[PDB]
Amino acid sequence: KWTYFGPDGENSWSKKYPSCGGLLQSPIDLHSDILQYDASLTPLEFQGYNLSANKQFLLTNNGHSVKLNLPSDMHIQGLQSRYSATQLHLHWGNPNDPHGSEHTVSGQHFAAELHIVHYNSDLYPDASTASNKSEGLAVLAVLIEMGSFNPSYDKIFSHLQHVKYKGQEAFVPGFNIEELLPERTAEYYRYRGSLTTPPCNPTVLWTVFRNPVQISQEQLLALETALYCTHMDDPSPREMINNFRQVQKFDERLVYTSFSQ
Amino acid sequence: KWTYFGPDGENSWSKKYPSCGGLLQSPIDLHSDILQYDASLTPLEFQGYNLSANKQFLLTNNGHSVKLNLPSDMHIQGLQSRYSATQLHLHWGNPNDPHGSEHTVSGQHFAAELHIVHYNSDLYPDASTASNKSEGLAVLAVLIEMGSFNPSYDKIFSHLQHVKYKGQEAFVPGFNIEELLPERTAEYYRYRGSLTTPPCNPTVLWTVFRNPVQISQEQLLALETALYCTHMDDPSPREMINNFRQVQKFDERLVYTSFSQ
Numbered sequence: 276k277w278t279y280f281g282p283d284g285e286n287s288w289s290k291k292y293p294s295c296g297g298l299l300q301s302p303i304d305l306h307s308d309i310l311q312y313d314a315s316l317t318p319l320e321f322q323g324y325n326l327s328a329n330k331q332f333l334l335t336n337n338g339h340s341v342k343l344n345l346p347s348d349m350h351i352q353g354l355q356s357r358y359s360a361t362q363l364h365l366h367w368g369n370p371n372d373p374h375g376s377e378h379t380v381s382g383q384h385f386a387a388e389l390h391i392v393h394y395n396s397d398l399y400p401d402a403s404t405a406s407n408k409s410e411g412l413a414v415l416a417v418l419i420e421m422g423s424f425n426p427s428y429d430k431i432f433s434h435l436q437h438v439k440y441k442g443q444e445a446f447v448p449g450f451n452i453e454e455l456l457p458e459r460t461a462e463y464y465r466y467r468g469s470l471t472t473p474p475c476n477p478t479v480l481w482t483v484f485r486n487p488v489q490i491s492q493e494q495l496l497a498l499e500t501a502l503y504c505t506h507m508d509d510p511s512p513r514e515m516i517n518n519f520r521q522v523q524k525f526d527e528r529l530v531y532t533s534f535s536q
Numbered sequence: 537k538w539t540y541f542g543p544d545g546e547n548s549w550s551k552k553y554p555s556c557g558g559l560l561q562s563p564i565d566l567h568s569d570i571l572q573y574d575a576s577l578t579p580l581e582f583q584g585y586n587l588s589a590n591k592q593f594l595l596t597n598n599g600h601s602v603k604l605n606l607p608s609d610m611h612i613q614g615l616q617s618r619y620s621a622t623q624l625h626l627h628w629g630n631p632n633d634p635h636g637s638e639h640t641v642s643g644q645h646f647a648a649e650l651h652i653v654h655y656n657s658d659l660y661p662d663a664s665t666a667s668n669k670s671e672g673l674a675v676l677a678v679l680i681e682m683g684s685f686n687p688s689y690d691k692i693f694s695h696l697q698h699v700k701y702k703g704q705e706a707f708v709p710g711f712n713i714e715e716l717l718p719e720r721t722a723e724y725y726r727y728r729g730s731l732t733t734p735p736c737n738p739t740v741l742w743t744v745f746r747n748p749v750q751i752s753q754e755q756l757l758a759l760e761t762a763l764y765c766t767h768m769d770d771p772s773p774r775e776m777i778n779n780f781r782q783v784q785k786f787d788e789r790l791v792y793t794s795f796s797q
């Protein structure tokens with residue numbers, strides 16, 4: 276039982292989930308003092324991201340975020356194991372302070388952040404089993420800023436009203452998941468970290484793309500206002516807002532970059 | 537026991553100190569979304585700050601920071617109650633990332649931060665009894681940036697190499713504590729928050745001055761490198777670095793500013 280606000284909020288996660296007070300925690304502020312260019316980092320290749328429009332994919336409000344299930348045929352190459360997709364989900368702020376990304380860059384939050392979660396399918400049978408094991412997970416993070424209307428993100432956002440409450444599910448027709456990625460994916464930040472939610476396992480290889488994408492003011496407000504953390508029938512409904520973790524200490528370590536300027 | 541790094545670091549404070557997981561936690565990022573000018577915020581008066589040069593004040597390495605005791609005849613006037621001084625202390629980062637303020641401004645961490653802690657002497661007999669009481673504490677924060685040498689801060693820093701280890705103490709001849717404050721003290725941010733160390737009591741009226749002061753690179757390096765969290769005895773010394781808390785969520789709330797933007 277955990278939240279992002281109140282008694283069971285992030286400073287208390289370590290009570291029930293010891294790893295939330297352990298090693299390698301994410302997210303972090305990405306800033307120049309902890310960055311080191313690594314010329315060996317290569318562009319990731321995204322395979323099977325173009326999902327068939329004749330297929331459909333489950334969108335679930337899980338009480339903490341809205342997730343879209345992704346098929347294990349979607350994978351990334353360019354890492355030292357094949358990683359296969361499991362789901363994507365988002366983090367955001369609130370209409371009074373619409374700056375809810377998890378990673379920050381030079382101190383600055385972006386409006387929101389997409390995570391595409393993959394698991395090490397060379398070592399592990401599925402995502403759950405991978406999640407608390409060495410080299411288990413790889414997550415792609417895309418920073419989102421307010422800007423132009425984004426029809427690709429609308430392929431998810433247009434279904435939000437069908438997953439308003441915890442446990443509610445809706446199907447989303449296949450679309451090209453690559454369209455959720457930015458410009459010049461070749462430039463990114465890379466570091467070893469953790470899940471940013473309980474149980475906070477330090478088993479995540481992060482890739483945060485350097486370049487943000489844009490979604491409109493209206494799209495971001497729709498995201499921030501659409502969802503609730505609680506089930507329909509909860510006596511005390513709670514809006515799903517500010518579902519991002521504060522940045523963690525990141526000391527005597529380095530984030531590697533695929534870009535040197 | 538509590539620390540800023542490892543199993544007893546800040547995500548685990550709420551285990552021993554429940555208020556660290558409660559409401560009204562400090563420090564925070566001070567950014568436009570959550571700022572509001574309040575014309576009724578008047579200049580504080582700093583009375584008794586010109587400490588007797590014929591008196592000495594105890595400086596102590598307490599294993600968490602370096603603290604200077606201050607006398608109760610030093611006070612702030614301007615609030616609903618008189619608040620009298622109890623001690624001042626600093627927070628800093630480390631030489632590889634010399635950004636260890638507690639409060640941030642528009643996401644920007646300053647080099648270090650000075651806190652001058654006061655208690656409500658009208659209502660309570662001393663700081664320790666005031667600290668878990670409503671209106672109990674008022675802390676002044678001065679953001680510190682690397683630049684020019686600061687002869688006033690050296691009145692404290694020149695003693696650092698003499699309180700290297702936990703429990704060690706020096707005496708500081710009285711000097712004018714107002715010399716530690718930045719220009720235009722009438723310009724500040726004001727909010728209700730907490731102690732930023734265990735027990736994290738939500739009993740602090742914060743006043744963070746708008747303008748930073750400067751200390752030299754050499755001063756900052758001495759502050760970052762002089763001190764240990766451990767006793768002189770210890771065969772496993774721990775460097776007293778990165779002794780700042782990460783910023784806290786601050787939602788549905790405002791910080792009031794005595795300056796307009």
Ligand SMILES: NS(=O)(=O)c1c(F)c(F)c(S(=O)(=O)CCO)c(NCc2ccccc2)c1F
Nearest residue numbers: 340342364390392402403406414469470471472
């Ligand atoms: N931000 S993160 O990518 O570290 C993250 C979440 F924020 C998160 F909420 C989750 S979730 O499992 O609570 C579903 C909500 O999106 C996962 N999941 C990683 C994972 C995937 C499959 C099995 C176990 C863990 C997750 F990886």
Ligand SMILES: NS(=O)(=O)c1c(F)c(F)c(S(=O)(=O)CCO)c(NCc2ccccc2)c1F
Nearest residue numbers: 601651653663664667675730731732733734735
């Ligand atoms: N950031 S802060 O201004 O809120 C702060 C500290 F950082 C700090 F280390 C201390 S400490 O040195 O006393 C030991 C850990 O709490 C206090 N102490 C304020 C205080 C003074 C007298 C009685 C009760 C609390 C304290 F108030």
Ligand SMILES: [Zn+2]
Nearest residue numbers: 364366390471
């Ligand atoms: Zn996530």
Ligand SMILES: [Zn+2]
Nearest residue numbers: 625627651732
């Ligand atoms: Zn302090």
